[PDB]
Scaffold this active site. Structure first.
Site, mmCIF file in Angstrom:
data_model
loop_
_atom_site.group_PDB
_atom_site.id
_atom_site.type_symbol
_atom_site.label_atom_id
_atom_site.label_comp_id
_atom_site.label_asym_id
_atom_site.label_seq_id
_atom_site.Cartn_x
_atom_site.Cartn_y
_atom_site.Cartn_z
ATOM 1 N N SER A 122 0.823 -1.210 0.000
ATOM 2 C CA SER A 122 0.000 0.000 0.000
ATOM 3 C C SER A 122 0.870 1.279 0.000
ATOM 4 C CB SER A 122 -0.990 -0.062 1.162
ATOM 5 O OG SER A 122 -2.105 0.776 0.926
ATOM 6 N N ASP A 239 -9.992 -4.131 -5.256
ATOM 7 C CA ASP A 239 -9.329 -3.236 -4.318
ATOM 8 C C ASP A 239 -9.898 -1.826 -4.445
ATOM 9 O OD1 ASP A 239 -7.460 -1.648 -2.868
ATOM 10 O OD2 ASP A 239 -5.774 -2.992 -3.404
ATOM 11 N N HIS A 269 -8.090 -5.266 -0.533
ATOM 12 C CA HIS A 269 -6.784 -4.615 -0.466
ATOM 13 C C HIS A 269 -5.673 -5.363 0.264
ATOM 14 C CE1 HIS A 269 -4.013 -1.363 -0.520
ATOM 15 N NE2 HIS A 269 -4.080 -1.107 0.781
HETATM 16 O O1 LIG Z 1 -2.900 -3.660 6.658
HETATM 17 C C1 LIG Z 1 -3.299 -2.571 6.298
HETATM 18 C C2 LIG Z 1 -4.037 -1.653 7.293
HETATM 19 O O2 LIG Z 1 -4.368 -0.400 6.749
HETATM 20 C C3 LIG Z 1 -4.777 -0.452 5.394
HETATM 21 C C4 LIG Z 1 -5.402 0.895 4.987
HETATM 22 C C5 LIG Z 1 -4.320 1.992 4.829
HETATM 23 N N1 LIG Z 1 -3.202 1.510 3.963
HETATM 24 C C6 LIG Z 1 -2.529 2.397 3.103
HETATM 25 O O3 LIG Z 1 -1.270 2.436 3.061
HETATM 26 N N2 LIG Z 1 -3.315 3.221 2.309
HETATM 27 C C7 LIG Z 1 -4.578 2.668 1.654
HETATM 28 C C8 LIG Z 1 -5.576 3.832 1.566
HETATM 29 C C9 LIG Z 1 -4.979 4.922 0.698
HETATM 30 C C10 LIG Z 1 -5.993 6.078 0.688
HETATM 31 C C11 LIG Z 1 -5.593 7.212 -0.185
HETATM 32 C C12 LIG Z 1 -5.949 8.517 0.207
HETATM 33 C C13 LIG Z 1 -5.590 9.593 -0.603
HETATM 34 C C14 LIG Z 1 -4.833 9.373 -1.760
HETATM 35 C C15 LIG Z 1 -4.506 10.549 -2.634
HETATM 36 F F1 LIG Z 1 -4.366 11.708 -1.952
HETATM 37 F F2 LIG Z 1 -3.375 10.396 -3.340
HETATM 38 F F3 LIG Z 1 -5.460 10.777 -3.559
HETATM 39 C C16 LIG Z 1 -4.475 8.099 -2.161
HETATM 40 C C17 LIG Z 1 -4.865 7.018 -1.389
HETATM 41 C C18 LIG Z 1 -3.621 5.404 1.272
HETATM 42 C C19 LIG Z 1 -2.643 4.247 1.509
HETATM 43 C C20 LIG Z 1 -2.509 0.342 4.532
HETATM 44 C C21 LIG Z 1 -3.508 -0.843 4.524
HETATM 45 N N3 LIG Z 1 -2.987 -2.088 5.083
#
Ligand SMILES: O=C1CO[C@H]2CCN(C(=O)N3CCC(Cc4ccc(C(F)(F)F)cc4)CC3)C[C@H]2N1
Ligand code: NA
Ligand code: NA
Length: 295
Positions: A122, A239, A269
């Site tokens: 991610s 995802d 995801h």
């Molecule tokens: O095991 C897990 C627990 O948490 C989960 C959710 C958050 N996650 C992550 O690293 N995340 C997944 C959600 C993602 C959301 C996002 C927000 C804005 C933008 C922008 F500004 F560029 F448009 C892009 C994307 C950000 C990155 C790790 C994942 N893995």
């Protein structure tokens, strides 16, 4: 007589002197984790966690990798887990990249001549891509689990609007809503574990952090034709957080001579915490991919 100040503590009040740690270039303590094999390691591998989470969530993957005679190492990124910093705040997204490189450089001093791999999920996957792109030819390989290459189109629109508002005005509390836990995995036990972990930040994403994620997406797009590192890319077709279109874009635009994509039909995801049929395959595929490139 002057006296030494009280021991520096994690945000959970544990003294850093009692934990593996590193001090970054900004003087911030990063909590570290190591999984070393009994014998001389075949290679090193840094595990890069994602937004709001921490390195402790990679226990099982790290133990599998250690079982392959790799020395696995990680740290909680600034603003995450047991590391210092305001939660989910980063002065610039490059701080995450700079800190991974300091840790990699430190480990390479202790284990010279060993190949070094990256594993990222991610946001951690966007960090791994920018890390390898900064040092072409340095890393032996990269394992990417649903990396942040392209955001879900709806979320991209939401943060582009939110960014343009604070570009013009002063709104320090402005935040989006929290990440919907139900879209993380079809494995409800893993959704429940994510919602129970006190080290996970489940608050709404602050606009300043959203801006850094927008910077991460823009920088990853520019980095793709500079990427030559070997990589394995694992992506779920359903995802809602890192759009599967990003995984196809990475396969298309990276210059890497050794690139492989595996799509998990219907998976959400967090592939390494998905339904057992998916998780077992993810672990097996990483094991085979790394075993082939360390033998
Ligand atoms: O095991 C897990 C627990 O948490 C989960 C959710 C958050 N996650 C992550 O690293 N995340 C997944 C959600 C993602 C959301 C996002 C927000 C804005 C933008 C922008 F500004 F560029 F448009 C892009 C994307 C950000 C990155 C790790 C994942 N893995
Ligand atoms: Na310093
Ligand atoms: Na060595």
């Amino acid at each position: 007589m002057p006296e030494e100040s009280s021991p520096r503590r994690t945000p959970q009040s544990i003294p850093y002197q009692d934990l593996p740690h590193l001090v970054n270039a900004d003087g911030q303590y990063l909590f570290c984790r190591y999984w070393a094999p009994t014998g001389t390691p075949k290679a090193l591998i840094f595990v890069s966690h994602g937004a709001g989470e921490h390195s402790g969530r990679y226990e099982e993957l790290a133990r599998m990798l250690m079982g392959l005679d790799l020395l696995v190492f990680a740290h909680d990124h600034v603003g995450h887990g047991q590391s210092e910093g305001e939660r989910m705040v980063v002065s610039d997204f490059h701080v995450f990249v700079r800190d991974v490189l300091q840790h990699v450089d430190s480990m390479q001093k202790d284990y010279p001549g060993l190949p070094v791999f990256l594993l990222g999920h991610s946001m951690g996957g966007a960090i791994a891509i920018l890390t390898a792109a900064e040092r072409p030819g340095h890393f032996a390989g990269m394992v990417l689990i649903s990396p942040l290459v392209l955001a879900n189109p709806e979320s991209a629109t939401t943060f582009k609007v939110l960014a343009a508002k604070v570009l013009n005005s002063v709104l320090p509390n402005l935040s989006s809503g929290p990440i919907d836990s139900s879209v993380l995995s079809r494995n409800k036990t893993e959704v429940d574990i994510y919602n129970s972990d006190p080290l996970i930040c489940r608050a709404g994403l602050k606009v300043c952090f959203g801006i850094q994620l927008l910077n991460a997406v823009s920088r990853v797009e520019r980095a793709l034709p500079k990427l030559t590192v070997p990589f394995l890319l694992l992506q779920g077709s359903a995802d809602r957080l890192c759009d599967s279109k990003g995984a196809y874009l990475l396969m298309e635009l990276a210059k890497s001579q050794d690139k492989t994509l595996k799509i998990y039909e219907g998976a959400y995801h967090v592939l390494h915490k998905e339904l057992p049929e998916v998780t077992n395959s993810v672990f097996h595929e990483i094991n085979m991919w790394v075993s082939q490139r360390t033998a």
